[PDB]
Amino acid sequence: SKVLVLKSSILAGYSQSNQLSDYFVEQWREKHSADEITVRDLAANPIPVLDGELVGALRAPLTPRQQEALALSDELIAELKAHDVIVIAAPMYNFNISTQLKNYFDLVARAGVTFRYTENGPEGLVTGKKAIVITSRGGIHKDGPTDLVTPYLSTFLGFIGITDVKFVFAEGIAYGPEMAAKAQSDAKAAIDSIVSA
Amino acid sequence: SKVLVLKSSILAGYSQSNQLSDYFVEQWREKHSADEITVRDLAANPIPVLDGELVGALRAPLTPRQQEALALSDELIAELKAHDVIVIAAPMYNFNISTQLKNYFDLVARAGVTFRYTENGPEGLVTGKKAIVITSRGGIHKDGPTDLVTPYLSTFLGFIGITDVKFVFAEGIAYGPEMAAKAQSDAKAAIDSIVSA
Ligand SMILES: Cc1cc2nc3c(=O)[nH]c(=O)nc-3n(C[C@H](O)[C@H](O)[C@H](O)COP(=O)(O)O)c2cc1C
Ligand SMILES: Cc1cc2nc3c(=O)[nH]c(=O)nc-3n(C[C@H](O)[C@H](O)[C@H](O)COP(=O)(O)O)c2cc1C
Q: Which ligand is nearest to the CA of B54?
A: 1
Q: Of ligand 1's atoms, which has the minimum distance to the CA of residue B55?
A: 1
Give contacts of A46 with chain B, Cβ < 8 Å. Answer: 49, 51
Best probe of the B interface among A9, A15, A17, A49, by most B CBs < 10 A, is: A49
Cα A14 → chain centroid: 19
Cα B120 to Cα A140, B116, B123, B155: the distances in Å are 14, 11, 9, 17
Q: How far is the CA of A110 from the centre of ligand 1 (A)?
A: 29
Name, in order, each residue with C-beta under 8 angstroms of B103's C-beta and a sequence gap of 6 or more.
A49, A99, B42, B46, B47, B48, B49, B50
Which residue type sits at B31? K
- In whole angstroms, what is the distance from residue A117 CA to residue B138 CA? 13
Give contacts of B126 with chain A, Cβ < 8 Å. Answer: none
Residue B171, exposed/middle/buried by CB under 10 A (0-12, 13-18, 19+)?
buried
B169 SS3 class = strand
- In whole angstroms, what is the distance from residue B25 CA to residue B87 CA? 9
Q: Which ligand is nearest to the CA of A94?
A: 1
- In whole angstroms, what is the distance from residue A36 CA to residue A21 CA? 15
How many Cβ atoms from other residues are within 10 Å of residue A142's Cβ? 14
For B99, the closest of A43, A106, A145 (CB atoms) is: A106
For B95, the closest of A46, A146, A156 (CB atoms) is: A156
Q: Which residues of B45-76 are buried (b: 16+ CB within 10 A; e: fewer)?
A: eebbbbbeebeebbeeeeeeebeebbeebeeb
**Adjacent-strand bridge partners of A96:** A93
- In whole angstroms, what is the distance from residue A109 CA to residue A157 CA? 10
Q: Of ligand 2's atoms, which has the minimum distance to the CA of residue A55?
A: 1
Cα A174 → chain centroid: 23
* Domains, in order of start, for chain B: 1-197 (3.40.50.360)
Give, using CA atoms, the residue closest to atom 1 of ligand 2.
B93
Asked if residues A170 and A135 have their Cβ atoms less than 8 Å apart, the reply is yes
- For CA atoms A40, A43, A46, A48, the dihedral sign is positive
Q: Do B52 and A11 touch (CB under 8 A)?
A: yes
Which residue type sits at B94? N
Q: Which experimental technique did the depositors report for determining this structure?
A: X-ray
Q: Is A17 in the pocket of ligand 1 (CB under 6 A)?
A: yes
Q: Which residue from B137, B175, B179 has its CB within 8 A of the most atoms of ligand 2, so it is best to mutate?
A: B137
Q: Do A94 and B106 touch (CB under 8 A)?
A: yes
Asked if residues B34 and B84 have their Cβ atoms less than 8 Å apart, the reply is no
Q: Is A124 in the pocket of ligand 1 (CB under 6 A)?
A: no
Residues with CB under 6 A from ligand 2: A 55; B 9, 11, 15-18, 91-95, 136-139, 173
For A148, the closest of B99, B106, B152 (CB atoms) is: B152
Asked if residues A35 and A66 have their Cβ atoms less than 8 Å apart, the reply is no
For B52, the closest of A12, A50, A106 (CB atoms) is: A12
Q: What number of residues does chain B have? A: 197
Resolution of the structure in the document, Å: 1.8
Quote the crossing angle between the two packed helices B16-31 and B177-195, to the nearest 10°.
30
Mapping DSSP onto H, E and C, the string for chain A reads: CEEEEEECCCCHHHCHHHHHHHHHHHHHHHHCCCCEEEEEECCCCCCCCCCHHHHHHHCCCCCHHHHHHHHHHHHHHHHHHHCCEEEEECCCECCECCHHHHHHHHHHCCECCCEEEECCEEEECCCCCEEEEEEECCCCCCCCCCCCHHHHHHHHHHHCCCCCEEEEEECCCCCCHHHHHHHHHHHHHHHHHHHCC
Asked if residues B40 and B6 have their Cβ atoms less than 8 Å apart, the reply is yes
- In whole angstroms, what is the distance from residue A161 CA to residue B23 CA? 38
